[PDB]
Amino acid sequence: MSYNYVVTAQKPTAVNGCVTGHFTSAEDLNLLIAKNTRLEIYVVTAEGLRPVKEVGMYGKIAVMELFRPKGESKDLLFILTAKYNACILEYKQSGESIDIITRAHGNVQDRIGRPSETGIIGIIDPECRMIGLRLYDGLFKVIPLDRDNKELKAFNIRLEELHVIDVKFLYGCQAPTICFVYQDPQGRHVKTYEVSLREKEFNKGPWKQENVEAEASMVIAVPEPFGGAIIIGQESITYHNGDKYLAIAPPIIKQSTIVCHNRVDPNGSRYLLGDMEGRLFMLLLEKETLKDLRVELLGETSIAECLTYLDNGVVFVGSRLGDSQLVKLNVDSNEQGSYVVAMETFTNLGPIVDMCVVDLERQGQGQLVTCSGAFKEGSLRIIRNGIGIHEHASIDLPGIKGLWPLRSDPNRETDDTLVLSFVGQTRVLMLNGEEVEETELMGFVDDQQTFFCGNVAHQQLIQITSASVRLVSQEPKALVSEWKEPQAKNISVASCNSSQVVVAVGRALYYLQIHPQELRQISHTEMEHEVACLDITPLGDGLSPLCAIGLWTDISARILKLPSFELLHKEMLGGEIIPRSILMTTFESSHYLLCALGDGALFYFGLNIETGLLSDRKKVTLGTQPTVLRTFRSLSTTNVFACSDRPTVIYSSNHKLVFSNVNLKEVNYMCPLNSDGYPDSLALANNSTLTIGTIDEIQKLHIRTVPLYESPRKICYQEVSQCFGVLSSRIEVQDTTALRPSASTQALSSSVSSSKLFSPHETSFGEEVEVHNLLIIDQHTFEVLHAHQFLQNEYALSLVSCKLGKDPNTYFIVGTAMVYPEEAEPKQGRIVVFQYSDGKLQTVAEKEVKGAVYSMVEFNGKLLASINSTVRLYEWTTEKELRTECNHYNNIMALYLKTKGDFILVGDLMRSVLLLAYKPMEGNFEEIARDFNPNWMSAVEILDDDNFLGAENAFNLFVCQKDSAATTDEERQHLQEVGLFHLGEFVNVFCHGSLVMQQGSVLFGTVNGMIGLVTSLSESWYNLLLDMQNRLNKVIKSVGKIEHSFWRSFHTERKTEPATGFIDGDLIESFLDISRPKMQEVVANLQYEATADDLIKVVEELTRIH
């Protein structure tokens, strides 16, 4: 009885692993980047990175290695996913066809055992003999790589050492030898083993095991001629090759831990090293052999998850905690001392820790403000969906039927005159600065409806009406030539170029050239049907040899050559509703053709200007009203504006057309405009008003970054003060001593807490301590207005903006906790009440509590907070203080709280969710129902009064339902889990709303930056889409040959069941991009009886809610 729909709003941004190699061919260099479920393939060049192919898998990438086995034409890819699907991939490319082909695959999950908590480790030996996997504790899984192992059958080896830190295969050994770091109670150690495929066992390692640093974390295998192994710890770096030993402890390392490494030279001569706090290092192995270890600092980058040296001093910085970088390394230090300068920068929303939904620009349409980033990469991210315009002038002019800009002054380059066509007549307007006032003009008639006007060659103007074609002088402003149909018939369709003119009279087309004082009639034709639309836009410089036309009866787009009118290419179109707009433009040096229909449908083709060839027919839908297409240029780039009930801009991103929305109600006509009072603006008219304004950037999503330089935690919006409330945390070193100027130390007004409620803790100076702050930020400029610092060892955990009880004052409310490192669970807390006055920040009230306030929320004028294992309810006094009223005790740790009207949904640490109620008669709570399953909750939201949603650390989603019709009192309180679905992200926040203007809508943000949508469906829709989803998996072949059934199967360490209740929206929306006959293969006799067109009607309406 639960029906839901899950779709991706923003694909994940964070980088999880990246490898470089010769994958597409042995000649060019590739860079591969592994985001959560997507891998991005690139070609490294001098200019930068050139993307070639971008593929989604049914699984998250856990291991990604490139290798060329013997006698193979180019490198092969190996991938293991989280659910233990292995695969080996090859790259085939014939022409424009790019497909990823799978050599071998298979699942290597063991039937019994618990996955290692340290994580999955994947390595390959140099010999290309086997693949080494650490999946479970105490075992070592091996996958032979002989060409006959086309199913990837594995075997295990008992590994007595249990807690393994890192493993590598060594170079230069007479038999495949490993080298790893394990942790005994007697500190941690390093040991070597050989591997035998015949005996399937281990044999003695080449040298004795040895002791290493107690915080040794990384193992690096040095290639020949050197050989041996480098082991990196938190204090020192060592070298290990049998007899040889070198060790250095440079003092620079002690500040921050080393995380990632990389080889520069294939000799192992030079290695890169990155640390937590952004620093970048260089490791050197001095020859004459393997003389020395020496370390030099190179600069500061983004917090590195992976580093890949590409070529010629260019390094890619894979970042999981902030924006990824492409970096150039220079040998001469810059002015300030560094060797590092940033080339480009790549957006990373992850990790999202909180977010809210605020209507900033257009009320009624949502935007997200997310708490993103990490320690030094902390930032606010403002996310808009679609393009808006910014008004500058509004005039009541109902009935406009056309718009044309016009520069009347032949000397100045700016437009100064706007021509408006009405029903059967025409008017003129000049633009003196911002005044818009009526104007007349010699040569132009005002009693006929205008089809076109504008500047033409030879310093002239042209007006094309229903009666004639009028050519006008520039400098004397007089009619110089006029054309009429020979029998004085009316003009039906018009189209004009800077030097060429083509009109239509019913079926007859006329071609005219514009010469000084002359309208030169060149040719003539009679067409098979009535004329509907025309376009002669020159795609080069401008004398177009081509004329595009669409007709009435035989509905069809035709290309004609000028002046021949000789047919070149005809494309039939279905239906009996005529086209009403056609256009030829140029997107990014590729020539396309656009043709809109009367129902709001749009066909678009490709165009060979030399031959007039239309290729790769495609079809989209834009609303319901007939579409009016027109060209405009912005930032020296050409784009197309589509006027309909869904106004849309058409542009090209990476040589594919993209359709971004326009955040308007409806646009009937449009023209560009550049005047001395309205620069680079646009002129827009609905059927009631005439507006002029400027346009945003041309992108589907615009993302504004606000660097805070410290870690944000929560956020909420106080409307009545035009502000944002942000909690943060920066790390200082105990002298407390900060590390770098961040937002909390650069506020306009700063403050500290003067509380004294907490009159035994020793700090080892140099240790790191978090310092928390309340940050308040402007809604428009986003500059830190005030930063309130909290006490020492006090963390800010919960934040609410609301008004309580009867006080019309609106407040900021914070819940904190006293966090001392040697304590296991905080015993002291605090709930503070603030108001942000006109400029200042006033402390109102406090309330001491014996625990951490992990969550709180406004509950019907009352404050509803959670302390460590208690759910409490406060009232707000007439004396402006807090008075507790209720409690709830049955839970381990109350971490997550949400409220409908008078219902309370509570998320616990290990028991999934509780449903509570408030009884006004007793002034207490009543536990209504619970879910018993041990789900490690991470987020929660209330969908409706009977369905509830949350996500746990098992990367999953589930929905619980209240069976209100209760046979018995026991069956009543079972929150029956009726939805189950494996997602693949770690959700940290749910909030209601949508990013689309004009049932249900829930947005969530994850660790990888992924933003998703969850909406509800009905029983008819569910049973249908579920049929498509099985039928698509019959057709869509997944990379790695992985079943979609297995991927989305709900999987925890305790349960593993198929998915029910949800539908994978990313899969349903891929139905549009698939080929045409495969659609007919999907729709084959599916009742629910609609086929192959009624579904395109559905999916396109589904792609519309995000």
Partner: protein, 322 residues
């Protein structure tokens, strides 16, 4: 891996489980008490865990709703006092074992058709196979008996006096793979029906239990590797303890013997590290856990009663901060 929960939790949203399990499984909260209508020996949860299954000193079997606390049924099973209970994960079968009234153990069809399926006359203790509950193992002194369920007939006996340790509390049991048996400290290849190894006897009265990873054997205080046979670890606190794991395989419950003492304790099954040592301050007779890690059932007397515990919650004394 910080110590303080609040710091550790913040690292989860940004970027371990041992410190979390250490917190939860040192906290046990009694909530309800299960008495009998007319003033027990064994305890177990049903398959779907909605009822609690109790054995008495008169041979009876009681069934309580965990939600309400009332008796749903009552059955007579033996003429001796009940010693052990084990339902099938199918929810279709149950195993019983009494003290001295032959037949000592028996297999039962559950409530739908509730009836006696087969008899196990010679065997004190009984236990299902681990992976595929198609076979049943029983203990007669130092002798192991493997039986089929549908036929009820015997498949093979396992004994070798040259290798016996003669433990007091011997209980033969299958590995998670159903291809090994441990009796009296002796590994048996089920298929080949021969002996594999004979572990040295370091105790008087404990036989041993397998670890779910299929890699280890838990004799009283010695962890033996299942193929190397080397001594891998020594856990002192397990001395004389009957060891039960949770359903997920992360935690051990140990129960001090000499039928049991006043305290049980919980361990971290990965590294065998102690978590806590809970003292209920009463004599303990049996215990069992649900598969949901929600409830803990304990039998104990002041007149024997079964008190039910909730996991992860604190006792009032520690909650009052004295």
């Amino acid at each position: 891996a910080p110590i303080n929960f609040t710091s550790r939790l913040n690292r989860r949203a940004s970027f371990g489980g041992c410190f979390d399990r250490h917190l939860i499984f040192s906290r046990f909260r009694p909530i309800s008490v299960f008495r009998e209508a007319n003033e027990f020996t064994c305890c177990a949860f049903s398959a779907r865990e909605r009822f609690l299954m109790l054995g008495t000193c008169t041979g009876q079997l009681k069934l309580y709703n965990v939600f309400s606390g009332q008796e749903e049924a009552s059955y007579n099973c033996h003429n001796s006092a009940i010693t052990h209970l084990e339902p099938s994960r199918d929810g279709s079968l149950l195993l019983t074992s009494a003290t001295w009234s032959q037949p000592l153990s028996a297999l039962w069809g559950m409530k739908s058709v509730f009836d006696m399926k087969h008899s196990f006359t010679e065997d004190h203790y009984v236990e299902f196979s681990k992976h595929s509950q198609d076979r049943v193992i029983g203990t007669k002194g130092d002798i192991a008996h493997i039986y089929d369920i549908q036929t009820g007939n015997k498949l093979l006996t396992l004994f070798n006096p040259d290798l016996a340790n003669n433990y007091k509390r011997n209980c033969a049991t299958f590995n998670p793979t159903d291809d090994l048996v441990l009796n009296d400290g002796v590994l048996w290849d089920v298929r080949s029906a021969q002996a594999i190894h004979k572990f040295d006897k370091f105790n008087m009265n404990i036989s041993g239990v397998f670890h779910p990873n299929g890699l280890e054997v838990i004799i009283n205080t010695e962890i033996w590797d299942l193929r190397t046979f080397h001594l891998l670890h020594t856990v002192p606190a397990l001395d004389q303890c009957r060891v039960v794991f949770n359903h997920t395989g992360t935690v051990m419950y140990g129960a001090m013997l000499q039928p049991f003492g006043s305290s049980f304790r919980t361990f971290n099954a990965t590294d065998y590290k102690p978590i806590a040592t809970i003292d209920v301050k009463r004599n303990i007779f049996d215990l069992c856990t649900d598969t949901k890690d929600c409830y803990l059932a304990v039998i104990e007397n002041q007149d024997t009663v079964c008190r039910l515990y909730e996991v992860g919650r604190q006792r009032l004394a520690e909650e009052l901060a004295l």
